[PDB]
């Protein structure tokens, strides 16, 4: 997160870190046994880390649970990042409490102008590289479809939306991928892609979760 703020420990209780020996992506807890993340974050050997603030220090509210299965969206295209969504099942159910909690799925899509909370442990610099140890947060609005498509000609599908600031300086970044965009208590987006980070006229591009609720629910029901 570039241009954000320190969230505060366990203030974002659905935020997870995906770990394969090291943090590599975020995710969102959607029930006691399932996480949603970005398909471009796929790899084998994932451990899900819940209840984290400092990802380098054990602070006392963590739960570390191995994934048993990952399911990339059946239409994911890694060239275009269309359908950049994946589900991860935990080997055992997490213990839900005030610091480890699920986030609701949308019953309706959000609109341009809605303010949302984006979070992660990704890079905090718009040029060069600095990785935080504690969770960072950014409040940002959803941008119009027309401004999103104008920013990224030929690249925005119906499964993507843009959020952030066209002036630059505030955005998600590398290492935030797969993490949440929450608006009015609903998971509306997944951190997906963008040109660099926090660049002028290059806002963040997010997977549009409301298009996937049927697939998520059916998949969970049968796995």
Catalytic site residue 84?
yes
Residues tagged in the binding site annotation for Ca(2+) = 52, 54, 57, 62
Element (H, E) at 163: strand 160-163
Spot the catalytic one: 17, 102, 177, 192: 177
DSSP 40: G
> Cβ of residue 135: shortest distance to Ca ion, in angstroms?
10
Residue that is written with structure tokens 């969504």 in the block: 85
Question: Three-class SS of residue 196?
Answer: coil
How many CB atoms are located within 10 Å of the residue 8 CB? 11
Would you list which residues are annotated within the binding site for substrate?
A: 171-172, 174-175, 177
Supply 65's token pair. Answer: 């649970």
Closer to Ca ion by Cβ: residue 59 or 145: 59
What CA–CA distance (Å, rounded) separates 142 from 144?
A: 7
User: Between 48 and 87, how does the x/- string for binding to Ca ion read (CB under 5 A)?
Assistant: ----x-x----x----------------------------
Least distance in Å: CB of 61 to Ca ion?
A: 8
In the region spanning residues 149 to 168, those forming contacts with Ca ion, defined by CB under 5 A, are none
* Catalytic annotation present for 177: yes
Q: Are 93 and 32 in contact (CB under 8 A)?
A: yes
Active-site residue list: 40, 84, 177
Applying CB under 5 A, the residues found at the interface with Ca ion are 52, 54, 59
């Amino acid at each position: 997160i570039v241009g954000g703020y320190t969230c505060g420990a366990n203030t974002v209780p659905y935020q997870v870190s995906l770990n394969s020996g090291y943090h590599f992506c975020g995710g969102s807890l959607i029930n006691s046994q399932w996480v949603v993340s970005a398909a471009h974050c796929y790899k084998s050997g994932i451990q899900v880390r819940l209840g984290e603030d400092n990802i380098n220090v054990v602070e006392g509210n963590e739960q570390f649970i191995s994934a048993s299965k990952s399911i990339v969206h059946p239409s994911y295209n890694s060239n275009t990042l269309n359908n950049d969504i994946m589900l991860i099942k935990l080997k055992s159910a997490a213990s839900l409490n005030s610091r480890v909690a699920s986030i609701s799925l949308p019953t309706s899509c959000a609109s341009a102008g809605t303010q949302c909370l984006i979070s992660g442990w990704g890079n905090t610099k718009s040029s060069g590289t600095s990785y935080p140890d504690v969770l960072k947060c950014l409040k940002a609005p959803i941008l119009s479809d027309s401004s999103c498509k104008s920013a990224y000609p030929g690249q925005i599908t119906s499964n993507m939306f843009c959020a952030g600031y066209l002036e630059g300086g505030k955005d998600s970044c590398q290492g935030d991928s797969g993490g949440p965009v929450v608006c009015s208590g609903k998971l509306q987006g997944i951190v997906s892609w963008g040109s660099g980070c926090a660049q002028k006229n290059k806002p963040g591009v997010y997977t549009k979760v409301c298009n996937y609720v049927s697939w998520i629910k059916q998949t969970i029901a049968s796995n």
